[PDB]
Each structure stands twice: as C-alpha cells, then as structure tokens.
Design a protein around this ligand. Structure first.
Ligand SMILES: [Au+]
Ligand SMILES: [Au+]
Ligand SMILES: [Au+]
Ligand SMILES: [Au+]
Ligand SMILES: [Au+]
Ligand SMILES: [Au+]
Ligand SMILES: [Au+]
Ligand SMILES: [Au+]
Ligand SMILES: [Au+]
Ligand SMILES: [Au+]
Ligand SMILES: [Au+]
Ligand SMILES: [Au+]
Ligand SMILES: [Au+]
Ligand SMILES: [Au+]
Ligand SMILES: [Au+]
Ligand SMILES: [Au+]
Ligand SMILES: [Au+]
Ligand SMILES: [Au+]
Ligand SMILES: [Au+]
Ligand SMILES: [Au+]
Ligand SMILES: [Au+]
Ligand SMILES: [Au+]
Ligand SMILES: [Au+]
Ligand SMILES: [Au+]
Ligand SMILES: [Au+]
Ligand SMILES: [Au+]
Ligand SMILES: [Au+]
Ligand SMILES: [Au+]
Lengths: 529, 528
C-alpha cells in the first residue's frame, strides 16, 4: 500500500496513542518495517491533527517513538503543530521518561537536532534534543495565555526541575531558536528577561558550561545585565566568571558598561585574571562625582588583613594599581573633606602596603620580586630592627643609616629594595608613638626622619605624607615631644627648605610657636623667595 | 679630710642641688676625684635628708649630682635613701626629661647599676631599665590616691603614662623583681594584681617581643590567665605568637582550662596548630550539655567559612573534627540540639570531605593531601570523567563500587583522595537529586545504595546516608526522592538485616513502603 491511501497509518499511530500493549508493539514494529524517508510524514502528522481521535502516557508515546524510530521523523513529529493540551501532555510525559523501565531511547535516536553541535550531552537530558527543549520553552513562554489546569501547574514543576538540572540546554535552545520565540511571544523583552534569568542560572548551577553559553550570545546588553546581578547577589569569589568573560573577550565591555562602583568592586580580581584595561578605566571613568566610592573601597582594602578576609589577593589591588590610583586621586579636583579623607588614606595605604614607598622610581621589578601585599618576612623585620636599635644605642651614626638607605633606594636587588621598604615603613608607622619617646630616642628619630626628607629617601606621595606628619606635629603645643620632633626634623632638612616655599608659608601661617625656635624659624622665613 | 667631717660633703652635694654654671661641676669634679668605695654614702645621704635644705632640683643640678656621685652603686644608694615625696616626684619628672645629648650625665652608662633584668638588654634606651628609676616610678604611681594632689603629682602621672606606653616591659619586670617591697607598701593584693595584669596586657599590645620574657618571671598563673582572658576577647585575631609564648612557658594548657568555656573553644584550633596537646582531655572534661550550643555554633561557623580568612588558625584539623563528632553523638542532646548536630554532620562532611574515610586506619594517607585544603583540579576532573562514564552506559555501577572498595583501604595518599572525592561528590550532589531525570536518578540511587551495601560509608557518614535515605523516603510515592529512597534501600537489601532499628523506623514512619512489594518484604524480613 502506497501514497495518500498509505498515509492512513496516521490512524495506526492515532490508535497507538488511544488506549494497546499486546498488539501495540507489533503495530510499532510493523510501521518501523518501512523505509521512513520514502514516507511523507508531514501528511501523516497533519492528518492526526486534523481528524483528531476515534492524552498519551509515557508507554503510548514510547510506542509512537518506537514506531517512528528515526530521529528526523521524530523531530518531524515534534514540529507538527499540535493542540496546546497535547503539547503540555507530551512535555510532561517526557519529563517522566525512563529507558530503564523500557521507554524508547530518544537520546540514542540518530539524526535528531541538538541544542549544541559542540557540547556533548553529559547531563543525559532529553532537553539536549532541540525539539524537546524548544517544546518546553514554547509552553513556558506562553504560561499566562494558557488555561490553568492541573497540567499547567504540573508542567511548571517539570520546567522548574529542568531549569535546575540542565539550564545550559534550555538557554542554548532559546538562543539557537530565538527568531521563533521572539515571533511567538511578539515581545522581545520577555525573551530578554527569560534569557537573563537563564544566564544567571547557568552561572549558579553548572558553571562549567558558562563560557560555552556566553560564546553563542551576541548582544552584550544581556551579559552585562546578568553580570550586574551576579555581582551583587553572590558573595565572593567571582573569578572563573570573570575569566570566562575575558576568555570570550566580553570582560572589558562588562567592566566599562557595568554601573560604576560595581565595576570597581571587581577591578582587583579582573586584573589578577589578566584584564589590563585598568588605566584607561581610571582616566575615563573616575570623576569627582564618583570618588567617594574609590576612597571607601581603598580604605576597606587597607583595613583588610590576611586573617580578617577570605581571599584578599582578589579583593586587593596590586602595587601598580594602588600607585596609579594614588596618582589619579591627587590629580582629581577633590573637595576639602575628600582631600582630608584622601591624605588620611595615603597614610593608611602606606601603612598597609609598605612596598608602595619606593614604587614608581624605576625599581619596581625589584620591589615586586618580594610580593605585592604579602607582608615582609620576619628575618628582614629582625635585621632592620637590629640596624635601627644599633643606631639608637649610639653605635651607628644617623648619616650611616641615611647612606645605606640612599644606596638601597636605587638598587635593583629585590632584597635591598625590601630592606629599604622595611626600614622606612618602620620609622613612619612608628610615628604614632613618638609622643611617648624619651628625648634622646626622639631626637635621634627626628634627625633620621628629617634627613630622610633631606636626602630624598621619601618621594612622591610618601613625601607629602612625611610633610603632613611634620606639620601635624608642628601644630601640637610647644615644649611637647611632638612639637620638638617637628622642629628638629625641619631643622634636619633645612638646607633643602628652599624647595618648598608654599610649605614654609603654611608653617609660618599655622604654627606661631615657631617664632620661639630661633635657628629653624630663621631658616623657614628665609623661604620667602 | 676623713671620717664624719668628710661625710659633711653632704654640704657640697646639698649646694649642687641648689641653683651657678661655673662652681657646680667644679664641686662635682672635686668630689668625684675621691675613691667612691671608701666613702660611707648612706651616712652622707642621711645627713643630706636630715639637716637638709638651705626640694625640686633642676635637671642641670641633678645631672651635676650624678656627675658628683659617678658610680652606679653610689647612684642607686642615692635613690634608695628616703627623701620627701615632693622631691621624689620632681626627681622622677626631671629624669623623664633626661637628655644626654643636651649634656646630661649619662646614667645608662654608669657601671654597676641594678637593672630590671640581668638577661634582657636595654633595647629601648630607657632610664627605666635602671631598677632604681623603674621602682621610683612604680612607687610614686602606686601611691597616686594617697598622695596630696598638687600640680607635681599630675605632671608625674603624665610622665608615667608615657612610660606605660614606651617601655611597660621594664615597669613590669621591676614590679615583679621588687614585688615584696610593693606588696608591703600598698598592702592590697588587688591593687598589685590589677596593676600587674594591666601591665601584662600592655606588654602584649606594645612590645609583644618582650612578652615571653616577662611571662618567664611570673610565678602566679592567676594573673597570666586573667590577662589572657582580656587579650582573647579584646583583640580581633590572630593570636598565634601569644599562645606560642604561653606554650613555650608552659602556661597554655592551664589557660585553656582556666579560661571561661566558649572563649576557650574559640582559640582551640590555633592552640592545636601551635602544638597545645591537651584537646582530648579538654573535650572529655569540659563538654557538658549546658555548653554544647557553643560547640555546635563554632562548628557551623567553621563549615560556612571559605578560604572568613586564611582559616588554618580558625579551623580544626581532621583529627579534632573526628573527635568532636565522636564526643557529640555521645552527649545528651536536646531535640533541637539533635536536629542541629545531625544537620551539622552533613554540613561538616560537605565542607571537609577528607572527613569521610577518616579514622579507619588510613589517616596518614588522607592527611598527606592536606587537612582542609580542598581537592586538586586533576582529581575533580578525573573523578568527573569517571563518574560520567558510569552515567552514560560505559561503566557498570559494580565497577565503580569495586574501585571505591579498593581505595577505601589504601595507604597511597592519592587513592584515598580519589575516594574522598567520588563519595563526597555523590553526597554533595544529594541536594539536587529531585531534579534528576529518572535514569540518572536510578543509577545514582543504585550507586548510593551499593555504597551502603559494600561498606564504603561508615560511622557518622553512614548515619548521614541513612538520614538522607530516610528523609527522601518520607516524600510522597512516585516522587523522585521517594523512588530514590526505594531504589537505594533495595540496592542494599542484603545487608538490611544488620540494621533492625532502622528497618523498624522505615516501617513505622513510611507507610507508603507497603506499596513497593519487593522492598517492603525485605524490610519486614529484616525486622527480625
Ligand atoms: Au508487504
Ligand atoms: Au514486521
Ligand atoms: Au517501547
Ligand atoms: Au515504559
Ligand atoms: Au524560570
Ligand atoms: Au565559570
Ligand atoms: Au540575543
Ligand atoms: Au571580589
Ligand atoms: Au581573581
Ligand atoms: Au580625566
Ligand atoms: Au561627590
Ligand atoms: Au652617610
Ligand atoms: Au616594619
Ligand atoms: Au597624614
Ligand atoms: Au663643671
Ligand atoms: Au687631691
Ligand atoms: Au648647678
Ligand atoms: Au642638661
Ligand atoms: Au596604669
Ligand atoms: Au608576680
Ligand atoms: Au582566633
Ligand atoms: Au607574643
Ligand atoms: Au596558630
Ligand atoms: Au553534654
Ligand atoms: Au545531663
Ligand atoms: Au570548605
Ligand atoms: Au570531588
Ligand atoms: Au527512579
């Protein structure tokens, strides 16, 4: 039997849906006896649709698929336009599929369309089959336009399960078939929103697929929308995610297109990952309208300790970044409170990340060879300590230490540059305690500090720190350890006072008590030039 | 001139204590030319203090008096003499303003002065290194309240606060060394104790490198413990060196046991990491149902911690965790405490996967992979591909089970690691079974069950597995979790007989089992 007469195996399949066992299987086996490509199945299926009957279960469908047997035929069965109730039923019954109880093995039917031609089906999900994935998406996107039965809700539990088990397949299908779904719903932003939920969800469950999903998406509006949510939602670490954006070349776009201050949050980990659009980011993005964000961030990074915070390498800038940030920050037009906060921060920053001190004079390779924020080894701390106390015990002259530091500041040997860092840092951090010092130790420290300013061992921002400290002590009551320290330090660098007339005018303005310190006062007023 | 009439250089020294530039250190140079040991100086100073003032010397004049005396023993002799209080006060105050660079007598280089230690060097270049001066200050300050309040007392007090910040190690060394004398002076144990504890805490904050040394000299552990109780609560972490200092001086075990509980528990991981050695006995002795909410809380927190910093110091090693589980299931837990604890065994094995096969005689192997470190990527990847092969047809479940059974008893670290990884992966994946397609779910169900059957899951981990299977079994029939419980239970049915209590529970609490004929049969068969 052939042709349109033959096409009434439509009836065979139709009853093989209708409720049978004994004869059902010989029916499927008999239809399978056919050469499928020489049958016009469109006719058969549309025939089933048109003249309706004379709800399938997994057993029945299983025999329908056994009858059809060929992946292209099965796909054809799916693409036929069924009553929504039947499609809902079909999807629901496939969610209950098991080969182990003897259902037809669809996953092994050759020539079905896949949600991906690259990604293998590791999840072992029927949603790998594009027909099925798209069935589910098609039903789900239409949720509201459908009758609410028991089956609607049941399907919703099914899809929620699918959404948890294999969202990568759901999203690969949503993209591969996107024209269709946009045209079906006739609302692009519903497709967009569902797309973003999916993307976020592929990140949460099964991140090993994320890159692969990202690959197939063009509009980066979506990826940014998703990244924005992933950022605030997740507690850290997000590294793999950022590395997947980098590896697919979407990361820079996300950092720049993300709202500011979410971007800034993730800037340190982006760098450890290899991002390297940072200085451009600073130049373009950093404005006086957002600076308070930057200050908040850096303050926080200084308060972090390797034992207070989970990662900190990925939460803290490297020396190069901190450096760049300091430069730009003293360049931006900060208001008064913002500048007080910033200067405060430069001190907190120098205390927190001491390798910053000598950074940016062209010895950086040597500096960085000791680590960025890692913290100084105990033997260098101990050596620096021995050196210093030996100065305080009279054995070494101040100018000896000064000579040493002056050698080390220009050294390319990492341990050198490190010892420099430790010594200078030590003095500066120790500045909070000068007011408790006996007068001899205080005088020695005062001359050491001052000479550090004289011989140019403190430069850049570190020198402004120094100057602000000296100023801050100068503003303390005279005859006080702090005031005596200010005075002696200033005297100790006096030969170079000529280079900072502004500073001298500020000392003269704001420290009247200087009028009682003869030699120094004279030196400072001579800085009217 | 000799004798008592010589002892009337009381007059000379007395004049130097009064304010010219020229004459003063001529007098000084003259007096110093004498041989110091031959003079009876006690008599001299006594005379100086009795027919006396013809009060409040200048720093220049004091420097002159020291230049006159020159000798450490003589100088000490000058300090010990009992002078008026206003003089003692002016004396401490002028010493606080000492400068050798401004030309003051160099007191620190005088030979044969009494120090605060004969061991510790004067690294701080403090006059408080000299026991006479340290003690002078302690003496004045301990008497704050009972002394007339002038401007001198206030001045001095501010000096002492500077000393308190600069060199507390010297003040406390001196307080202990002369402890008898100060006890006699105050006659209040609580004042000496308050000051001692305060000093000790202060040595910890500034100059911690001195702490161990200070701690050596103290016999009473009561104060060390008090101080440590303050230090623990006040500081945010880390305390490592501090505890190490207590261990090296043998006060650590004492402090852990004499500290209030729950502070003590907080510092237990770091203590062990340092080498403490008393954890066993601590658990056995101190853990009571009134304090277990603290143990539970601390353990939960440890589970939720992510590498909450570098956590090595905040987190127990595997041996401690194991011990804690053992002890906790032996304690009379409340209902809520029970829920919590079991939930905790799960969260625990999720967070510390090397716990799984721990304590069966393979621990060295396990521990060679790290304690809490986290499984290497090569292992996760290998393990993943392996398991996958099982889920798509290639490997039979009994193959995986055979392998695991092999690795369970292995002393090779990596075998034990792979085991940890596969088993942990299945269990951690348990939260997601309700999303599994039926075939994958069935395979996992049989794998899990067989894990129970062939004794891959033992001890507390077995109790976890059973609690999971049970919890899934209470879910409505035809639901995925229920089908999972059923298939798992079925897959170990042969060993059901080994667990009558479990079977009876299954029979009482899960009526729906009566609908799976095979399994129901086996369970009542195993009900004895
Ligand atoms: Au035929
Ligand atoms: Au046939
Ligand atoms: Au079939
Ligand atoms: Au079936
Ligand atoms: Au959804
Ligand atoms: Au990822
Ligand atoms: Au798109
Ligand atoms: Au982060
Ligand atoms: Au990172
Ligand atoms: Au700009
Ligand atoms: Au602003
Ligand atoms: Au020099
Ligand atoms: Au330092
Ligand atoms: Au500052
Ligand atoms: Au003289
Ligand atoms: Au003579
Ligand atoms: Au004099
Ligand atoms: Au003097
Ligand atoms: Au005090
Ligand atoms: Au004592
Ligand atoms: Au701690
Ligand atoms: Au210490
Ligand atoms: Au520790
Ligand atoms: Au208990
Ligand atoms: Au009890
Ligand atoms: Au963990
Ligand atoms: Au694993
Ligand atoms: Au099942």
């Amino acid at each position: 039997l052939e042709g349109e007469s033959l096409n009434d195996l439509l009836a065979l399949l139709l009853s093989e849906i209708l409720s049978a066992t004994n004869r059902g299987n010989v029916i499927a086996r008999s239809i399978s006896s056919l050469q499928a490509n020489q049958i016009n199945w469109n006719r058969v299926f549309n025939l089933m649709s048109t003249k309706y009957f004379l709800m399938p279960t997994t057993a029945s469908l299983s025999c329908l698929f056994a009858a059809l047997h060929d992946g292209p035929v099965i796909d054809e069965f799916f693409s036929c336009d069924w009553k929504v109730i039947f499609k809902l039923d079909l999807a629901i019954q496939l969610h209950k599929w098991s080969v182990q109880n003897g259902c037809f093995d669809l996953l092994n039917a050759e020539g079905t369309r896949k949600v991906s031609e690259t990604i293998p089906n590791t999840k072992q999900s029927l949603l790998y089959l594009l027909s099925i994935a798209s069935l589910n998406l098609e039903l789900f996107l239409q949720r509201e336009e459908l009758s609410d039965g028991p089956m609607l809700a049941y399907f919703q539990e099914c899809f929620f399960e699918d959404f948890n088990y294999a969202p990568e397949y759901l999203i690969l299908a949503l993209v591969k078939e996107m024209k269709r779904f946009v045209l079906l719903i006739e609302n692009r932003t519903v497709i967009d929103e569902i797309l973003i939920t999916l993307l976020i969800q592929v990140h949460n469950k099964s991140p090993s697929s994320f890159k692969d999903v990202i690959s197939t998406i063009t509009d980066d509006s979506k990826i940014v929308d998703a990244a924005k949510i992933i950022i605030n939602s997740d507690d850290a670490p997000i590294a793999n995610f950022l590395k997947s954006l980098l590896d697919t070349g979407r990361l820079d776009t996300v950092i720049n297109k993300l709202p500011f201050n979410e971007a800034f949050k993730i800037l340190p980990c982006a760098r450890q990952i290899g991002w390297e659009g940072f200085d451009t980011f600073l130049k373009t993005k950093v404005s006086p309208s957002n600076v308070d964000v930057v200050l908040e961030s850096l303050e926080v990074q200084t308060k972090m300790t390797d034992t207070n915070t989970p990662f900190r390498s990925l939460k803290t800038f490297d020396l190069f970044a901190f450096h760049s940030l300091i430069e730009v920050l003293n360049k931006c037009p900060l208001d008064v409170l913002q500048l007080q906060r910033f200067e405060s921060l430069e001190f907190s920053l120098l205390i927190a990340f001491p390798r910053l001190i000598n950074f940016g004079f062209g010895h950086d390779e040597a500096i960085l060879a000791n680590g960025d924020i890692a913290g100084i080894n105990n033997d260098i701390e101990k050596e620096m300590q021995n050196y210093l106390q030996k100065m305080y015990s009279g054995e070494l002259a101040i100018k000896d230490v000064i000579e040493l530091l002056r050698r080390l500041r220009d050294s390319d040997l990492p341990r050198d540059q490190e010892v420099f860092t430790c010594i200078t840092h030590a003095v500066i951090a120790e500045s909070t305690f000068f007011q408790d010092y006996p007068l001899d130790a205080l005088a020695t420290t005062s001359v050491l500090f001052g000479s550090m300013i004289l011989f140019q061992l403190l430069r850049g921002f570190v020198l402004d720190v120094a100057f602000r400290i000296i100023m801050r002590f100068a503003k303390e009551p005279p005859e006080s350890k702090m005031f005596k320290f200010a005075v002696q330090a200033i005297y100790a660098f006096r030969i170079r006072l000529a280079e900072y007339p502004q500073y001298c005018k500020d000392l003269l303005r704001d420290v009247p008590a200087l009028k009682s310190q003869a030699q120094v006062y004279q030196s400072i007023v001579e800085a009217a030039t």
